[model samples]
Target: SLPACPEESPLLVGPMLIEFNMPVDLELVAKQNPNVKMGGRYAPRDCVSPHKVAIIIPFRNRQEHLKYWLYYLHPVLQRQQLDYGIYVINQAGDTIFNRAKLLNVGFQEALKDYDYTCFVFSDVDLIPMNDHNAYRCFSQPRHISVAMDKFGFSLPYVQYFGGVSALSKQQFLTINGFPNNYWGWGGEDDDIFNRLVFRGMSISRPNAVVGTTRHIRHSRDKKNEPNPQRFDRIAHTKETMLSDGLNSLTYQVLDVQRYPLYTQITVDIGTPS
Candidate 1:
């Protein structure tokens, strides 16, 4: 057994400057965060963290965005003093990017390596601008990116659970994980919100200032077109929650590589039927 870390991490620096204009260098990032292990794992040597977090990022391409994310987050997470590991779930092939499914894959695959009590699902382009926005889970589902520069540094809507969020292992299972059928984007995050509500949970968030995130602007990917089926799918989340999430997830893992900065899991998640 080990002593738990303090409730408030000593290394937190309130608001921070997140720059996307300059290209990020991974070599420097790795060197700066030398304590991080081969597979993006880090744990404080002084005390045991209350939460063992797995930072899950869904990916297809977006290499530059990932570099920025790693460059910024590795240091922030370290300063947060939580035992954490980074996992980049890469979808294989040219099918429409299944963001939600890749997230589920990350959850399952990450578990195979360690018993992570918390899972922070994040987008490759979004970086939190405040170290005070702790990535750990709470009594309710934690929405980490409440205020985003893309949406004028404020929440676009009350129910928006996109960009970045955290869930405890129990909370995630109680909501049955995320929907596996949202082929592209839009509806999946809303579907997750519905699931949490249906399971008698609410979204917990930090104040706008601490939760602010900077979104790296870029053109949408070719295959990830605005999902036409999203609206209809969002409407049926309540009815479909029981059958369409982790219980029904299906994917083929093509590769697992431990990069210096993160663990990359490449998988083939089939296209929408």
Candidate 2:
């Protein structure tokens, strides 16, 4: 049996300088991270990691941003010494992008291959600027991306849990997972925060420096425009929380492809009604 990795990883390098000006080369990134397995799985060889995390990203047509995310995050996760895998849950076709539902699919699918105890639901365009951010679940739900360059490196509000967050399996189940009805951008994160608060679990966070993140800026995608119904849906989260989450989740898997850097699960999450 391997010894457990240190409580605090020795490989962490504080703040990182991230630039999106240069295009990322996947081949070079793959060469650099020779230890990563075919399905984007990686664990420290010398020691065991306490957290088995599935980093789930709900994605659509964001390949350029994904390249940057993988190019930067692989080394950071490796340095943090976590047993982690990257799961890109891509929404198939041009239906309205359901970020939260795809995340539920990721949770369900990732479990098929590994008993992941922790889940990091992340946006493909966000990259943590510090290795110390540590993409693992804690006693409480973790809001990992505390400070983003887009928000002037400060949280937009106390209830913001958008860009990236971590949840333990039990905590996720207790809240019935993210709402499946949030079919577009906005609302879903707030609904999730409400679910957590309703269930009496507080959000935890690291210092701004450790949780600093960089977002790859881009215009909104087609068919993913802001949801007109989000506010009403958010207002009724308590009433719908029981009926509209993982328990009532439904989707069709189009494909599951394992690339050298990550496992991509393309799914058809039907358009809004």
Candidate 3:
């Protein structure tokens, strides 16, 4: 037989859309990708995956958004060909939501189940429009959600490090993990950026063309009050951050279940003073 002719790669490689005009149906999407394992985990059975990754979501009362996330991410993750699992670290009660702390909890909880080399912390409402952006950790921190539709397909600011990001276990530890005390949305991302810079880590990214995502719009959650102390806390991070993160994280696991789409870990993250 003749040698195989050269052809385009089977993988998707290009810029991606940040939103879809058409509506989505979760059950239909589920049927389209049947092999995704229970607890929203998947690894290609036929080949040894290059990376073992855990996608952690700090979640609460966002069921419809979660449905959309599951519908889109499952297929893209599968195509990325990573040994990956999904963990939705849900805050258990009516207590004030702590996104960063829940992320730290997710890191610890995910490790209990497997030897994950990479942790991709993501928002439940963001979805990658292209499969080529990759879902694995890089040498430096990987900014997976580069351009958001919410930001007019451009980065909102020079130091915007929210949305989706990937860091190796060692890197996460070196920066002391995310600040648990921020207790709200705005400052935690900036604090983490400070931690990364303090530890001399650089943020890496794909070109703006390839790394893009759609952020489903929603009003801020009732529990996610903006931290009034955020500015001051961020201002003093150099001194407080080292001692106030993963090293001091504390929580109680209320429940753990392996659902068909993802592992739901509910924890009481404690009441805010």
Best by lDDT: 2
| Model 2 steric clash total | 0
TM-score of each: 0.98, 0.98, 0.92
Per-candidate count of clashing residue pairs (backbone under 3 Å): 0, 0, 3
Winner on TM-score between 2 and 3 is 2
List where candidate 1 sits over 4 angstroms from the true fold: none
Q: What is the C-alpha RMSD of each candidate to the true structure, in Å?
A: 0.9, 0.8, 3.8
Better TM-score candidate (1, 3): 1
> Order of all candidates by lDDT, from best down to worst?
2, 1, 3
Clashes of 3: 3
Error of 2 at 127 (Å): 0.9
Across 1-273, the per-residue lDDT of candidate 1 in tens digits comes to 678889999999888887888967788889998999999999999999988999999998889999999999998999999999999999999978889999999999999999999999999999999999999889889999999998998999999999899999999998789998888767899999999999999999999989999999998788888889899988988889998888998899999999999999999998887
lDDT of 2 at 102: 95
Candidate 3 global Cα RMSD = 3.8
Error of 3 at 206 (Å): 1.1
Report lDDT per candidate: 0.92, 0.93, 0.84
- TM-score computed on alpha carbons, candidate 1: 0.98
Cα lDDT tens digits, model 2, 6-98, are 999999988899999997899889999999999899999999999999999999999999999999999989998999999999999987889
